[PDB]
A paper describes a structure:
Neurotransmitter:sodium symporters (NSS) terminate the signal transmission in brain by active reuptake of neurotransmitters from the synaptic cleft through a Na+-dependent mechanism.
The intracellular side of the transporter is fully closed, while the extracellular side is slightly more open than for the outward-oriented, Na+/substrate-occluded state. At the unwound part between TM1a and TM1b, we observe a key difference to the Na+-bound forms at the substrate-binding site: Leu25, which is conserved in all NSS, has rotated due to a neighbouring flip at the polypeptide chain, and it now directs the side chain into the vacant S1 substrate-binding site.
Numbering used by the authors: 4 to 131, 135 to 473, 479 to 507
The structure:
């Protein structure tokens, strides 16, 4: 036997939680603003239907199939679906990807905590018109916290505050994970997910009331959701939608499979998975599209709305919005809520992105939950020093694991399960015990459409983003060693 989810609600709130921390409140509207505004819904909804939902259900079934046999991670689950030596090595990726993401994500999550503390106590720059006059003091503020050097220097010089807050952040993640699934992860989601919703609605209401001489939030929603179907001719818009889907549903990160391995043998996953995925989609379109960009376009105007979009999602949430809140009534408290929202949202994703390593140490190496959590914490905390001190090291990990990895591994899940294990055998496994059954239209979708989409996407990135700065070689060296480390642990699990 193993740990199990206590309630259907807690399972859904925990499953939906591991995608709200991926920054979709910033990620989605930026992608929508740069791919036809409201016309981006056609690629986004289709990618949500032809790629997201089928790959989501697939990850739910692979976890429950593995969890019934006591295996919450993919080095063992792949071996069940494909009795082969190549399947165990491919399974290492489903343990390597979430571990590498945690090595830099928890540190980023710690930024939101430290920024929430500084805003709460008022230790923020308070300017004083032009955007650079307002944005630059908060650019220095983030760069002084992270320790970004002034030039091409390879060394980061993070503040002691950022380091201490990172320690505190790791302590919070351990406190949730060391309690377990029901006592820890599920108890956290049932409380924080509703709190995130209430807190997000307040920001939405507070943003809709923004009025500056340069624009209104109505212009922000108008700019964000004005459709332009001329963009739909460009295949790049469809590339951005499918890749976006991997983040609204957290596909390929190894988190859905591990969380689903604690779903009991016959408990429903079809309806419970569709609800958690629908919760993810609506929460990022409504709440996410009503805060970040509307507040940005309202403050700077429609003239800078194009520049805000090209600036990117991360700059919007760590530079632009704090600078906007700085110039609004009660904005020091408003900035606290924004970073409090990002922290507690990210807290759902970090505990879920470290559970596969914990489940592996538990299921395959027979370690206690206490020792599995603390060893996982030690591996992540130690390795994060590479991200905290080496410039552009975060980017290198985010590229191999966060970008290419989840799309490559998502294609791997769909092939091992729906082709090698048997499509009919896989279809039985998904719809088994389902309160609602998957429509048979998704059979052709899972077997042909979704793998084709992921194959087209992988080649596009293999052509565009395949080709100085020797510090990335150190990062490549370290994450490759982590793969050798996990392969050795998988090997040690076979001997036991
Ligand atoms: C606590 C978590 C903070 C969430 C911030 C994530 C916002 C996403 O930000 C985007 O992420 C991409 C990679 O994922 C990068 O390539 C983009 O440059 C960046 O703008
Ligand atoms: C691998 C675990 C080792 C923990 C010790 C690492 C200490 C690095 O921490 C450093 O301590 C300095 C003290 O002034 C601070 O100025 C730096 O901001 C901080 O990065
Ligand atoms: C100054 C910041 C302190 C943060 C600590 C509280 C953060 C909220 O997190 C809580 O921490 C508790 C620690 O025991 C855990 O028991 C709870 O499970 C967890 O929800
Ligand atoms: C940030 C958006 C995602 C948060 C969604 C959490 C919504 C509250 O979550 C749950 O929804 C159920 C249906 O109303 C209620 O019965 C439960 O009391 C509540 O915990
Ligand atoms: C009493 C509860 C108030 C909820 C938050 C509202 C914050 C008010 O904020 C104010 O609202 C005005 C429009 O009414 C605008 O001029 C500005 O957005 C702002 O000055
Ligand atoms: C350096 C990585 C630490 C690995 C996790 C172990 C944390 C050490 O904690 C140990 O846990 C044991 C549990 O029985 C206790 O008996 C010990 O008193 C305690 O020191
Ligand atoms: C899982 C969330 C990933 C964190 C988002 C990345 C934020 C770190 O910073 C980002 O690094 C990127 C590297 O590609 C750059 O493209 C962005 O310009 C930069 O903002």
């Amino acid at each position: 036997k193993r740990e199990h989810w206590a309630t259907r609600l807690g399972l859904i709130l925990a499953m939906a939680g591991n995608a709200v921390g991926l920054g979709n409140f910033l990620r989605f509207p930026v992608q929508a603003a740069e791919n036809g505004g409201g016309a981006f819904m056609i690629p986004y909804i289709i990618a949500f239907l032809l790629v997201g939902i089928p790959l989501m259900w697939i990850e739910w079934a692979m976890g429950r199939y593995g969890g019934a046999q006591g295996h919450g991670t993919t080095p063992a689950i792949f071996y069940l679906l494909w009795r082969n030596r190549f399947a165990k090595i491919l399974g290492v990726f489903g343990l390597w990807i979430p571990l590498v993401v945690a090595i830099y994500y928890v540190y980023i999550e710690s930024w939101t905590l430290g920024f929430a503390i500084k805003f709460l106590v008022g230790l923020v720059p308070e300017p004083p018109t032009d955007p650079d006059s307002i944005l630059r003091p908060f650019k220095e503020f983030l760069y002084s916290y992270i320790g970004v050097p002034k030039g091409d220097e390879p060394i980061l010089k993070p503040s002691l505050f950022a380091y201490i807050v990172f320690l505190i952040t790791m302590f919070i993640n351990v406190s949730i994970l060391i309690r377990g699934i029901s006592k820890g992860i599920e108890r956290f989601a049932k409380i924080a997910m509703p709190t995130l919703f209430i807190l997000a609605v307040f920001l939405v209401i507070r943003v809709f009331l923004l009025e500056t001489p340069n624009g209104t939030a109505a212009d922000g929603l108008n700019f964000l959701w004005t459709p332009d179907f001329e963009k739909l001719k460009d295949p790049g818009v469809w590339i951005a939608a499918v890749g976006q889907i991997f983040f609204t549903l957290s596909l390929g990160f190894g988190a859905i499979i591990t969380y689903a391995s604690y779903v009991r043998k016959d408990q429903d996953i079809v309806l419970s998975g569709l609800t958690a995925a629908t919760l993810n989609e609506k929460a990022e379109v409504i709440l996410g599209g009503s805060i970040s960009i509307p507040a940005a376009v309202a403050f700077f105007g429609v003239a800078n709305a194009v520049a805000i979009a090209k600036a990117g999602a991360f700059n919007l949430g760590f530079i632009t919005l704090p600078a906007i809140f700085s110039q609004t009534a009660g904005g020091t408290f408003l900035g606290f809520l924004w970073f409090f929202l990002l922290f507690f949202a990210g807290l759902h994703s970090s505990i879920a992105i470290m559970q596969p390593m914990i489940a592996f140490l538990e299921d395959e190496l027979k370690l206690s939950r206490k020792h599995a959590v603390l060893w996982t914490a030690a591996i992540v905390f130690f390795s994060a020093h590479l991200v905290m001190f080496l410039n552009k090291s975060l980017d290198e990990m985010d590229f191999w694991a966060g970008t290419i990895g989840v799309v490559f591994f998502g294609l791997t899940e769909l092939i091992i399960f729906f082709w090698i294990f048997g499509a009919d055998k896989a279809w039985e496994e998904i719809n088994r015990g389902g309160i609602i059954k998957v429509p048979r239209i998704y059979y052709y979708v899972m077997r042909y459409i979704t793998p084709a989409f992921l194959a087209v996407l992988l080649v596009v990135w293999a052509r565009e983003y395949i080709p100085t700065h020797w510090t990335v070689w150190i990062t490549r060296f370290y994450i490759i060693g982590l793969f050798l480390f996990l392969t050795f642990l998988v090997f040690l699990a076979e001997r036991r």
